[PDB]
Amino acid sequence: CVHTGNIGSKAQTIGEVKRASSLSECRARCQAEKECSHYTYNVKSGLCYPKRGKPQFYKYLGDMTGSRTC
Numbered sequence: 001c002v003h004t005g006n007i008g009s010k011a012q013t014i015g016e017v018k019r020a021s022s023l024s025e026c027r028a029r030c031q032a033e034k035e036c037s038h039y040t041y042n043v044k045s046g047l048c049y050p051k052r053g054k055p056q057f058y059k060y061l062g063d064m065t066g067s068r069t070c
């Protein structure tokens with residue numbers, strides 16, 4: 001499972017990109033979204049990214065994409 005890394009997902013977000021208290025907070029949000037197959041928690045700004053579809057991983061120090069679960 002993917003969690004901690006420097007790989008951001010250049011994929012379409014389900015809704016508005018809101019910030020989260022922590023990574024687990026983003027996971028909880030991704031658990032609320034039934035279409036959220038993976039979330040990218042930008043620890044650099046603290047933004048939660050509940051995305052769907054195919055994820056386009058790119059190199060960025062601060063973007064941590066999690067495989068939803070795990």
Ligand SMILES: CC(=O)N[C@@H]1[C@@H](O[C@@H]2O[C@H](CO)[C@H](O)[C@H](O)[C@H]2O)[C@H](O)[C@@H](CO)O[C@H]1O
Binds near residue numbers: 010013060
């Ligand atoms: C912060 C930034 O400039 N990010 C660029 C990406 O743009 C958005 O980045 C946020 C978090 O970094 C989310 O990933 C959002 O979905 C992105 O659209 C941009 O897509 C990528 C392209 O390689 O570069 C980042 O630097």
